[model samples]
Target: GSQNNECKMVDLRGAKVASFTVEGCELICLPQAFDLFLKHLVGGLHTVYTKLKRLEITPVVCNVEQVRILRGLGAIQPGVNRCKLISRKDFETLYNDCTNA
Candidate 1:
């Protein structure tokens, strides 16, 4: 069977209950600066936010300071004041689904 390599599975079950796996050349290459990494991360986050918004799903906004900390760690890019999202109901649902299943 030929699997569709272009397809990806995104698990947005709850608040911060999503996981993203970066592979291929992107993962192999390293960014020159922390700011670049943050830009990439924020781009991903923005994509998620856009989709959620389209779906009419409200997600909690990540605090500005938290994003700053992430930038400081060089885990993401700079100039991103906000990132991350949380949904209490979704989190509860995901929790129950995990426990029950």
Candidate 2:
């Protein structure tokens, strides 16, 4: 019984949240940037979440389809279940705190 071959697809037209192109980089979502820069510096996703709250950097909650989209784009790992989005400016602030914390 090989039950691991299922590849479920989804329609994600309405799942788009916030995205930003900071400086010279292409459009990036919050969790995408987290995976790119924060995960290594921070303890866990929840830690970043708390920091975001403290910094008043509101992040858009990502839907299932959006999570899948980010996953497909290699923005997040395959094991990632959920995600969030924020502007690059806010991410810069968060990253600074992460580095200095």
Candidate 3:
């Protein structure tokens, strides 16, 4: 392969995740967030989901492809088959609750 053109066009067909952006900030994967913040607790992701509901924090559910990407990225556990995503602002809310509770 030789480089001849200055303009670059790339297609990321399978290199993206099931996530959205908030302004300019990228959304966070919920399972990974739990692994970072609440994995120390006795409960697992379900418990976090329940707590999220209680806090009125709605996260985006990850599809099959997204799950695979997160799993491969080490953002989630190998045994985990499902995943979710949330915004940093909402995470701050949950983070405070988890830290204070």
Q: Please state every model's RMSD to the true fold in angstroms.
A: 15.6, 10.8, 9.7
Local accuracy of candidate 3 as per-residue lDDT tens digits, 36-86: 566785347777777789999888766676677667777677998987777
Winning model by TM-score: 3
lDDT of 2 by residue, 1-101 (tens): 12221222221222433343323332346665665566678868789889889999777666676677667766678998887666556777888999985
Candidate 1 lDDT (Cα, 0 to 1): 0.35
Query: In model 3, which runs have C-alpha deviations exceeding 4 angstroms?
Result: 1-25, 41-43
- Model 3 root mean square deviation, Cα atoms: 9.7
Instruction: Give one digit per residue, the lDDT tens place, for model 1 in 36-73.
Output: 23234434444544544555656444345444544565
Better of 1 and 2 by lDDT: 2
Residue 41 deviation, candidate 1, in Å?
14
The lDDT for every candidate, in the order shown, is: 0.35, 0.62, 0.62
TM-score of each: 0.34, 0.63, 0.66
Would you give me the overall lDDT of model 2? 0.62
Number of backbone clashes in candidate 3: 0
